Design a protein around this nucleic acid. Structure first.
Lengths: 116, 153, 82, 208, 101, 126, 100
RNA sequence: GGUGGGCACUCUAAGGAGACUGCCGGUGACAAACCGGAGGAAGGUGGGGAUGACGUCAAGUCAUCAUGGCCCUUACGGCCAGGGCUACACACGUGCUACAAUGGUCGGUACAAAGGGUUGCCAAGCCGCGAGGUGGAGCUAAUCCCAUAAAACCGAUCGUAGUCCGGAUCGCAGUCUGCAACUCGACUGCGUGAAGUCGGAAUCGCUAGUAAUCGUGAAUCAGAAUGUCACGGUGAAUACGUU
């Protein structure tokens, strides 16, 4: 029900519910469920408490949720104070990995402004 | 303008019911040329129709299409410098085809789980004459019988 | 990026300049056109003037920015805004 | 202007044969072809005085045979076959592979597109009226036995400022029937006011 | 020697066809019989080239070269037949490959 | 004894042998039900032996190569049709009226230069 | 045309062949896992005093007469425009345009 | 088919035959021809392609090339290093991927054509989750490699949710090429998970193996396709009719 401080879905498979945790993907959930023994294809309601605790242990050894968001922000911060090219794109919100930035480039900038 | 006779395509009968009328229904529900996928829908749909009442899923198809196929329809027509929607009778070759049109189109927009039971859902829902495809038939019939003033071709 | 088995790549004329500088402690700017050289762990404290197409931008070496390229700290295009 | 494909190319497998007839696989293929076009450029470079029309290059196994068609073999060949030995020396070092030179006599220079284009272009270099050069050329082919000839010339004709395209055609010039044998050639005349292009079609008959 | 194999390649099928028959003719009448000319699949390399010097991408010419191949296996090659064939002086546009003796 | 026929639909060719037998089929050493997972083609092979009453008359050996799902189905379908015309002569009229002796000449067209595919030309603006 | 690029390309062409067998075997040491450090370092150093024209990546494969660097084909070694005029005249063997 | 063996079949590649309104009926000036049928694989130029009449736009190309005139001659010529051609408050054009269950995921299980390969194709085996590394067979090739086709089918799961749809974006760590992946390559794995739930006026493509959809190969190329060219798989609707 509650893993790493986040309530995962109760009416979904363990391998799919575990993906809700910030830091756990499809492979990590598969990796977690294989290391613990909990079967991927059982809903969360019909797993015993001791198996919830066992699943809770596997996630805790993995960087997840706040500390992963904590970890990410220095990595962005460590760049923008560095003054290099990748940091400068991070402080303006443009293509970081050399995208076209000419026509679309609108994952970053948000929306188009009227006044041209 | 054209002089062509177009082309006369023939449809082979279905392998599970021996009725070419289902062949063009299969021909209508097609998407991206996936013949095998779509025929799984109709037979599963026909099993659902057969399992829920009736005696033969093929005869209620016959019952369904007449309740969908209109007997009249207008077309845009310009004679006196203006558009007159002259109601015209629908030929037998077109009424059944457009009957197969409106069954899938309105069942595709239904809220049921899958098309397998969604065309099937409309099939009995249209056979009794209270479905949206039945509803679409009468408003077309409502489009005519009011523009009856224009009867010149 | 560059393969680990090939090792990281720095121009030897720069490598000569860095090796001379550390044993000299001149602390003077190093004027170079090699923006493509990887950043060694061992010129921390030296300043390097990296060419950006027209001028040599002086860059001060730290430890967090070890491992980058010398060109990442020398902008080559000027926007200034619309 | 782009309406018509090259008349000889459209029939390169029907009634016309390739000038270079040989085989090579990948890289000798690249080198051999470069050798042919250069010496073909060279062959016309030395004997522009001679009436050279077709240069066939046959390459058997590790040997190259050059076939040169001329309307005046007395110039390419020298005193008792002396000059021709001189030419065979600088191809056999330009090509590499040894070269054997075969010279044939073009019986009707007026029935060959190259020399007719050669004659008209060379005459136009002497500021003779473009009109008279073409009329003379077409009747020469017609009287000798050609069944059709069209000659087209373009580009600052007569020293005019605005270029134009004037063409004279006699007899039948199908240019669409693949089976019909068509002789086609182009020459660019370099006058004092620019470049004057000459196009000649010569129809010799149906190939049944 | 033992089942002499030759490999024939030509850009023109007419050139390769006449080349096979003359090899057959030089094979018979010398006390040896031929297996027959095996038609090998034709390989053509394709090249799409644009014909305009500037722009006009839609104006192109499609080109082809035809590679024809034959096997024409030789069975029981007599001694007076083996030395009557490599000294052939023909096939300007065709290449003759000698294999298996 | 055996009766042979060759059928082609799009790019596949079928070699059928109508030796006398009870009713069995053999396509590439596998049966009709196992080789061909779709029952529609299962008629396609067998419609020719249903129109003419020969459903249980031979153990037909078939081999096919090339083509696709329906492409093989038509190629083998054209396979037997010639075989009964080889097996006897009175079924030619019955098979021709059904359009079975005719070889389907429809094939995939050559892609065009300046064209995305067969006849669809790229979207253009005024 | 622009013969100066033709001169540059031939100058590159002479340089790659001159250092071909040195550059190749030096790269072999780098790529060989058996050649460990302190000798692969000698190898990767050995490339960089080469005139930098010995890299085969610096060739543009221009046309053989006109030197055009865009419409090139390795099979004929020629520019696209020089391809069509040579193919049109029957100069190149066996090339007859396609229809199918 | 792997071993003898066979020259039957597919297939391969060369010649031919075959379709020509040839015949029949009707109509039509008795003429052209049209409407159908028989036969036939193909019926009315069977399908596709190449083929573009005299001419028009002083259309484009002096940057493929050539070329008259003009222009520069320590530079408007040449060499080199770095940068830019890839920037980006926006707009327009052309495509790809999506909004999902006619589907995603997992497992099993089939059916093609075409092309490339000796400065090359990188098999078997082994190592690594993976991109890849080692290894070196065989192959100048219908012989060996690229090379596993995918949609489709059969079972399980998901159950209509911005979701087991979507994978743009960012972070970390890598592989390969290349002297050198900062500007400015591709690919991989682990994380994250945007807009997007079918799209206004308006507008475009398509009449049969076509549209629609799914993969495959090649050119350019050290490396770099959603573009170009080419191939096959599954496979339609509609044409009353010319205002």
């Amino acid at each position: 029900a509650r893993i790493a401080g986040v309530n995962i879905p109760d009416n979904k498979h363990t391998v799919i519910s575990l993906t809700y945790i910030y830091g756990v993907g499809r492979t990590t959930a598969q990796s977690i469920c294989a290391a613990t023994g909990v079967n991927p294809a059982a809903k969360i309601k019909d797993l015993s408490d001791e198996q919830i605790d066992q699943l809770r242990n596997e996630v805790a050894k993995i960087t997840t949720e706040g500390d992963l968001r904590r970890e990410i922000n220095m990595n962005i911060k460590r760049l923008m104070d560095l003054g290099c090219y990748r940091g400068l794109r991070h402080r303006r919100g443009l293509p970081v990995r050399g995208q076209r930035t000419k026509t679309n480039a609108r994952t970053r900038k948000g929306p188009r402004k009227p006044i041209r | 303008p054209r002089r062509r006779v177009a082309a006369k395509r023939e449809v082979l009968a279905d392998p599970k019911y021996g009725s070419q009328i289902l062949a063009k229904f299969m021909n209508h529900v097609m998407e991206s040329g996936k013949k095998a996928v779509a025929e799984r829908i109709v037979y599963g749909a026909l099993d659902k129709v057969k399992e829920r009442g009736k005696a033969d899923p093929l005869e209620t198809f016959e019952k369904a299409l007449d309740a969908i196929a209109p007997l009249v329809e207008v077309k845009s027509r310009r004679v006196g410098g203006a558009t007159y929607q002259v109601p015209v009778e629908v030929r037998p070759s077109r009424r059944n085809a457009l009957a197969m049109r409106w069954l899938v189109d309105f069942a595709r927009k239904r809220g049921e789980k899958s098309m397998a039971l969604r065309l099937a859902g409309e099939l009995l829902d249209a056979a009794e004459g209270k479905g949206a495809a039945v509803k679409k038939r009468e408003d077309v019939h409502r489009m005519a019988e009011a523009n009856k003033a224009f009867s010149h071709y | 990026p560059r393969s680990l088995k090939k090792g990281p790549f720095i121009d030897l004329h720069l490598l000569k300049k860095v090796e001379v500088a550390v044993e000299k402690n001149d602390r003077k700017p190093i004027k170079t056109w090699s923006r493509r050289s990887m950043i060694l762990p061992h010129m921390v404290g030296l300043t390097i003037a990296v060419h950006n197409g027209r001028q040599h931008v002086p860059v001060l070496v730290n430890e967090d920015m070890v491992g980058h390229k010398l060109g990442e700290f020398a902008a080559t295009r000027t926007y200034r805004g619309h | 202007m782009g309406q018509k494909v090259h008349p000889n190319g459209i029939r390169l497998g029907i009634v016309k044969e390739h000038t270079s007839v040989w085989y090579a696989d990948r890289k000798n293929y690249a080198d051999y072809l470069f050798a042919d076009l250069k010496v073909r450029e060279y062959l016309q470079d030395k004997l522009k005085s001679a009436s050279v029309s077709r240069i066939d290059i046959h390459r058997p196994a590790q040997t190259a045979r050059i076939t040169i068609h001329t309307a005046r073999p007395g110039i390419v060949i020298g005193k008792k076959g002396e000059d021709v030995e001189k030419l065979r020396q600088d191809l056999t070092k330009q090509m590499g592979v040894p070269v054997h030179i075969n010279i044939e006599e073009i019986r009707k220079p007026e029935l060959d597109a190259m020399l007719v284009a050669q004659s008209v272009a060379q005459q136009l270099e002497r500021r003779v009226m473009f009109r008279r050069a073409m009329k003379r050329a077409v009747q020469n082919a017609m009287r000798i036995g050609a069944k059709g000839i069209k000659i087209q010339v373009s580009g600052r004709l007569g020293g005019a400022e605005i270029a134009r395209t004037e063409w004279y055609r006699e007899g039948r010039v199908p240019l669409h029937t693949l089976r019909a044998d068509i002789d086609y050639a182009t020459y660019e005349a370099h006058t004092t006011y620019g470049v004057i292009g000459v196009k000649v079609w010569i129809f010799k008959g149906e190939v049944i | 020697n033992q089942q002499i194999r030759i490999r024939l390649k030509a850009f023109d099928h007419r050139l390769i066809d006449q080349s096979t028959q003359e090899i057959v003719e030089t094979a018979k009448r010398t006390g040896a019989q031929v297996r027959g000319p095996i038609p090998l699949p034709t390989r053509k390399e394709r090249f799409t080239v644009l014909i305009s010097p500037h722009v006009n991408k839609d104006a192109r010419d499609q080109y082809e070269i035809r590679t024809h191949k034959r096997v024409l296996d030789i069975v029981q090659p007599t001694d007076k037949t083996v030395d009557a064939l490599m000294k052939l002086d023909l096939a300007a546009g065709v290449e003759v490959q000698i294999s298996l003796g | 004894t055996q009766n042979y026929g060759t059928g082609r639909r799009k790019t596949a060719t079928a070699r059928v042998f109508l030796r006398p037998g009870t009713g069995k089929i053999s396509i590439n050493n596998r049966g009709l039900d196992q080789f061909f997972g779709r029952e529609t083609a299962r008629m396609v092979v067998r419609q020719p032996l249903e129109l003419t009453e020969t459903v249980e008359k031979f153990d037909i050996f078939v081999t096919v190569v090339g083509g696709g799902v329906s492409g093989q189905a038509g190629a083998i379908r054209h396979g037997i049709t010639r075989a009964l015309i080889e097996y006897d002569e009175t079924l030619r009229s019955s098979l021709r009226k059904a359009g079975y002796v005719t070889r389907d000449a429809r094939e995939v067209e050559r892609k065009k230069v300046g064209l995305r595919k067969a006849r669809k030309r790229p979207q253009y603006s005024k | 045309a622009k013969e100066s690029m033709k001169n540059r390309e031939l100058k590159r062409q002479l340089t790659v062949a001159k250092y071909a067998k040195k550059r190749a075997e030096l790269k072999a040491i780098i790529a060989n896992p058996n050649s460990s450090a302190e000798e692969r370092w000698n190898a990767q150093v050995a490339l960089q005093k080469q005139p930098r024209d010995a890299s085969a990546s610096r060739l543009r494969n221009r046309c053989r007469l006109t030197g055009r660097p865009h419409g090139f084909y390795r099979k004929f070694g020629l520019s696209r425009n020089k391809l069509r005029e040579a193919a049109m005249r029957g100069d190149v063997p066996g090339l007859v345009k396609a229809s199918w």
